[PDB]
A paper describes a structure:
We then determine high-resolution structures of complexes of GSH and its initial breakdown product Cys-Gly (CG) bound to EV-F3 and by a competition binding study demonstrate that GSH binds more strongly. The CG portion of GSH anchors the two adjacent protomers via not only these salt bridges, but also by additional H-bonding interactions with Y231 of protomer A and the carbonyl oxygen of W154 of protomer B via a bridging water molecule.
Enteroviruses are responsible for a range of animal and human diseases.
Numbering used by the authors:
A (entry chain C), E (entry chain C): 1 to 243
B (entry chain A), F (entry chain A): 4 to 274
C (entry chain D), G (entry chain D), I (entry chain D): 22 to 69
D (entry chain B): 1 to 244
H (entry chain C): 1 to 49
Write the structure that this text describes.
């Protein structure tokens, strides 16, 4: 026999190990691979698909209503419409999105984010709103003047129903942790900032028209987005074995 | 019939420097979600960008990297020196939820078995004993007792190891009669029956059972067994909407209705 | 990252015995992100 | 025309030595495992003495006593070479030598009329054991030229299914179609040669699977006759005559 | 010694493993391979050989009689003669056939099937029968009209005593399970259909001839047939060790 | 003398598209089972078919794939620290029935031995002990006791292992004096004797015995042993009609007569 | 299925020590299915 | 270390095994082979007497 | 029988460590069976 010296690690079962092992059916010949549409090779292909943000997560909103950002005819100027931390993996409106679910399967992320909004009022309903991304350092902007100093887009309601605000990757490090859990890891260190929306002018409507309307909010990863360090999704759990 | 190409990349996209734009021609920001297409607005078109040669890889999100690790699929204790486990991945939710992210998938699997002896009070014992795990395909006779003739296993594959040896491990090929396993099936298990209990399950996903025993009788103790499965050489099709409700049953995707997924906050205007 | 050079010999008869695949690339996501018949260029309006 | 049109002619003539057999209602000819009898190769042989090859004196057709297809007929069988161990020079050569090797040409005969119906399975089974009894009787394992009646046809006397005996060289004598079956059999064994008085390489069985019936008043006495010819035989280990 | 790390699976005894091992008699030289007729290299060669189906498996039929399909002069038209599920591995008339035995040594099958029938009445006995294969979806056909809508052959009794009905492989998947066990696996999913036989005209005979006759039924695998996943044949069992 | 060729294939046959046929010439469906030949009617001749490039393999039904796995052939407990097992595969029916599917066969074998200590009540013990398995060919002296001189095993092959080590395993060549093993023998074991007990057994199939002992005396306990055999490099001749009745004896194929193989149904016209 | 490339070196003296054969093909079954002297073409009647 | 998987038979002592093993005296140099009549290489040479 | 090809590398310094010899042939037994000075042909009488 060839002299050998076995080392530490011998006999261990590392769940992420990658060895060759004897097959239970050495001569088995599988069915042929047939042509099936929709092959996916990497989940980055999935997170780049836009999905709805559960943005109106308040007590008064149940089910489907939670996807609608309320808009209404104002009687004052420069008012706020919504606010949200842009971090894709933290608990909140983003957690149930495609981007959020996969981000929650990982410990770190990087990349620009695509936040698209679609106005759903009547054809006659007009308006202009400003959507801004505030890079980290302080608290969310308190008014439109402060918000507009950051990255932003001014959206004019019209034939093209939607607008995109790209939250560009602006970070000190190449990656950020996906959680902002503070008590233990002090990961608040990684906060990516805020996205806020304000009336640029006002929502305006004709006589007897609905004075309230909705905006749907979509989010997806941009082409420079990636994830690292797989981890179990915190949303999937159980008590005893299922029967 | 494929009109949309799918070129492969090994790194994420670079950022190219861009300058200001004041025009009535190009309007990258204007979109129309009604079309069903995700926005095509690029970073460079929305703000002035710098050059970034981005070498970030994409490996850890590949199907192989995502699925390529072991997860618990079975855990039980023998009774009378034997246990019959129907091969299915619905008992333990973590791996189950992962698989349901795809509609169809082909993959080989590496099964790892960790076993030890425990007493009546479920206290682990330092006791080395030989155990046998036999794969019984559908149609083959399943042993009723620890000493039944089926354990001869002249055709059924069996793996015999010892609790004193490292975990047992064997690879299995893509065994379905179908051209891919299905993790979502909107149909029934048979013709002539429309009972709810026969809905949503594709029989071809069930390849049989694993029956386990100790080769000889333990005195008052039992064999505790954990079976782990690791998908390998994964090919997948049609990504699915992720599970967003707790699982309740091993064989069905039944769930409890809910009015929210994430927790509520005071107001939509306070992040 | 991954090694540019490393052992890659199969010891077993069936491919099912082989270690994990080592490609791990991603592909253009258009079939999922923009499965439309008419091309809608980034610089133009989507609908006219 | 038969080889041109791709069909098998219903007439046949089998000529070996000083014997000729004819039939006008055959159903082709079976050659067991697609192999005609062959001589022992120098590379397979082990016994070193020059063999005796009797030629025409033993390679000819021997007709055995006929058997009646009675109302309760379960079938009949003959062991080879046992059945011919005391017939002609084939029998003498078999007795005078320790070793024997050879093939066979079997012709089973059973004619009735276009007013009769019935079907016989004619099968040549290698190493066919008569093991339905705890202790098989010599009279049944080696019935001689008279052959022996089947007692357990459904289980083929060996614990297997009669219906699967078709895996062995066979033909059928279906009265509406043919009145004879012909099988050419090569020597089969796990050895180059063996003793003809201790081992029977083949067993010929004629089993009724569809009972004999006929228009009322037709001839009721219908015999079954077996004619067998040793083919390509050789013997080694000469000494005095010895029978089992 | 060369550094090594032993892995999970070490020491295990997988019955289907395939390793090289020391020989008890390293210098042993076996007897030569001699010329023996009938060499078989694959059991597909065996299942392609026709064997009798124990088709008349009813209380009144014992032993050899179970292989005979009863036929008789009718006094009504379009009557049924027999029926059978075509599945080669399930309990029933097929289980004791060559095809059935080997199919029962495996978990999955694929391929067309050859069902051949031989008429055994007198030379003067005539008749025409229709044999049909009904692909799955419903129950076995209730009458000849329903049966003839499927794959079928019309057989005319004559000089050529036999006819073949090929049950072509018509399946959703490339393979089918060999059992239709439902209570546990719900394999009824794989049912391959039915084969039924009906009088096309009638069995006709001269004066004083037997008014009943028999048909023998043979079955075999076609050249596109194969089996996968070996398993122990359920028919072979024992209580204690044999002495 | 072979007039029928046997070309080899690695996949099943393809299906070629066919069209209708209305003629008096070609009649593929007409057959004649009396000839002893299996029907030669092809799918394409019986119905209109489509093109099917069938890549289904044939590997799992090869003799090597069918026989190439371990099956139990012996199981016993020592008595007085020793046990004598006559090498024969008739005690355990699964492997026995498989072998009887062929008339003659040549093959090497891999024997695997799994042993453990059990007490008087047949309860397994966690006790490592050295054991010896000695192959005693016919004609060699078989030890009467656990400490007899034959255990010196200077010529007889022996394998010494421990219940604390993995199962012992050794390969054996094709050892018969014949040119193939016989799984059906219509003859007697000797000249001059026609007793039923000497019928149907070919002596050359018996290569000797395995005698087992613990190297030193166990205190009140016994050694439980299982011997598995795996045919390798199989060459086979003359397929046989499969066993269709239960086995009753270890050395003979005697059986209980039966009037049916499959269970009865109400009527031949109801599937 | 089976690997197109994989280790195939024998470590022992006797062939009996070698791992299982890796051919596994099948052959024309005619010697068992149609062991007849006269060819009976599929398109013609069997007997004339 | 190179990943390995030990198999059944490991640790066993087959009396007819044939492995290489460390020598107790690795540098030992035996006496020369001298010319001695009657060398036998196979016992078939003896049974033929 | 013996393999025509198989590993044959020595891992140790001293030949005593090597596995068994693999020749195993036999030689003309004349030195034992016919150790005589005068040749006595098979076809002739031994002594004259
Ligand atoms: C002899 C050693 C035993 C090792 C285990 C062998 C297991 C064989 C079964 C393989 C089937 C795995 C695929 C199952 C995928 C479907 C899951 C589900 O829908 O529940
Ligand atoms: C020293 C280690 C012991 C290992 C076991 C060695 C066994 C040697 C005997 C080999 C004979 C096997 C072939 C038997 C086939 C015949 C079976 C039967 O008809 O019952
Ligand atoms: Cl969080
Ligand atoms: Cl927070
Ligand atoms: Cl069944
Ligand atoms: Cl059923
Ligand atoms: K790049
Ligand atoms: K645009
Ligand atoms: K985008
Ligand atoms: K001559
Ligand atoms: K093909
Ligand atoms: K034809
Ligand atoms: K056929």
């Amino acid at each position: 026999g060839i002299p050998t010296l076995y080392t530490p690690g011998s006999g261990q079962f590392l769940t992420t190990d990658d060895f060759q092992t004897p097959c239970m059916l050495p001569k088995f010949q599988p069915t042929p691979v047939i042509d099936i549409p929709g092959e996916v090779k990497n989940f980055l292909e999935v997170v780049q698909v836009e999905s709805l943000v559960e943005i109106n997560n308040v007590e008064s909103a149940e089910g489907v209503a939670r996807y609608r950002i309320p808009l209404n005819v104002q009687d004052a100027m420069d008012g706020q419409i919504m606010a949200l931390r842009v971090d894709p993996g933290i608990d909140g409106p983003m957690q149930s999105t495609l981007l959020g679910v996969f981000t929650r399967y990982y410990a770190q992320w990087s990349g620009s984010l695509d936040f698209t909004f679609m106005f759903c009022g009547t054809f006659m309903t007009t308006g202009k709103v400003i959507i801004a991304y505030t890079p980290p350092g302080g608290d969310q902007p308190t008014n439109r003047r402060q918000a507009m100093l950051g990255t932003h887009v001014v959206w004019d309601f019209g034939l093209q129903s939607s607008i995109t605000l790209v939250v560009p990757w602006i970070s000190s490090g190449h990656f950020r942790g996906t959680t902002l859990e503070n008590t233990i890891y002090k990961y608040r260190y990684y906060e990516a900032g805020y996205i806020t929306m304000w009336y640029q002018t006002n929502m305006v409507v004709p006589p007897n028209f609905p004075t309230t309307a909705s905006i749907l909010m979509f989010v997806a990863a941009q082409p420079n987005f990636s994830l690292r360090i797989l981890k179990d999704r915190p949303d999937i759990s159980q008590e005893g074995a299922l029967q | 019939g494929q009109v949309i190409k799918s070129a492969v990349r090994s790194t994420v996209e670079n950022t190219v420097q861009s300058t200001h734009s004041i025009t009535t021609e190009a309007t990258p920001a204007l979109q129309a979600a009604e079309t069903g297409a995700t926005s095509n607005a690029s970073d460079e078109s929305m703000i002035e960008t710098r050059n970034v040669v981005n070498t970030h890889g994409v490996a850890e999100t590949s199907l192989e990297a995502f699925y390529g690790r072991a997860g618990l699929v079975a855990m039980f204790s023998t009774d009378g020196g034997i246990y019959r486990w129907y091969i299915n991945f619905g008992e333990y939710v973590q791996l189950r939820a992962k698989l349901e992210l795809l509609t169809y998938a082909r993959f080989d699997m590496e099964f790892t078995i960790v076993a030890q002896v425990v007493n009546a009070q479920s206290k682990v014992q330092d006791f080395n004993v030989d155990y046998q795990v036999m794969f019984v395909p559908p149609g083959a006779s399943v042993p009723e007792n620890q000493d039944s003739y089926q354990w001869q296993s002249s055709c059924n594959p069996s793996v015999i190891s010892n609790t004193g040896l490292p975990p047992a491990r064997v690879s299995v090929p893509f065994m379905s009669s179908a051209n891919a396993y299905s993790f979502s099936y909107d149909g029934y298990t048979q013709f002539g029956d429309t009972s709810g209990s026969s809905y949503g399950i594709v029989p071809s996903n069930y390849l049989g059972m694993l029956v386990v025993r100790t080769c000889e009788d333990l005195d008052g103790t039992r064999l505790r067994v954990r079976v782990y499965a690791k998908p390998k050489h994964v090919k997948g099709w049609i990504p699915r909407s992720p599970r967003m409700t707790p699982y309740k049953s091993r064989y069905t995707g039944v769930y409890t209705d809910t009015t929210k997924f994430c927790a509520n906050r005071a107001r939509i205007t306070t992040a | 990252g991954s090694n540019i050079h490393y052992t890659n010999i199969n010891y077993y008869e069936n491919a099912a015995s082989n270690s994990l695949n080592k490609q791990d690339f991603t592909q253009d996501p258009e079939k999922f992100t923009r499965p439309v018949v008419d091309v809608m260029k980034e610089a133009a309006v989507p609908l006219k | 025309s038969a080889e041109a049109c791709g069909y098998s002619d219903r007439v046949a003539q089998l000529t070996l030595g000083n014997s000729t057999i004819t039939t006008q209602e055959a159903a082709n000819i079976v050659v067991g495992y697609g192999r005609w009898p062959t001589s022992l190769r120098d590379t397979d042989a082990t016994a070193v003495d020059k063999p005796t090859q009797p030629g025409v004196s033993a390679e000819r057709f021997y007709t055995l006593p006929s058997v009646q297809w009675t109302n309760s007929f379960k079938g009949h069988y003959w062991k080879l070479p046992d059945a011919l161990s005391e017939l002609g020079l084939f029998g003498q050569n078999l007795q005078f030598h320790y070793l024997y090797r050879g093939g066979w040409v079997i012709h089973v005969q059973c004619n009735a009329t276009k007013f009769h119906q019935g079907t016989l399975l004619v099968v040549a089974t290698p190493e066919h054991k008569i093991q339905s009894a705890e202790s098989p009787a010599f009279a049944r394992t080696n019935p001689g030229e008279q052959g022996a009646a089947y007692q357990f046809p459904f289980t083929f006397e060996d614990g297997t299914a009669l219906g699967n005996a078709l895996i062995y060289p066979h033909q059928w004598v279906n009265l509406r179609t043919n009145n004879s079956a012909t099988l050419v059999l090569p020597y089969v064994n796990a050895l180059p040669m063996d003793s003809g008085i201790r081992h029977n390489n083949w067993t010929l069985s004629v089993i009724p699977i569809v009972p004999l019936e006929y228009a009322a008043g037709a001839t009721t006495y219908v015999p079954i006759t077996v004619t067998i010819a040793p083919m390509c035989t050789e013997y080694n280990g000469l000494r005095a005559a010895v029978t089992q």
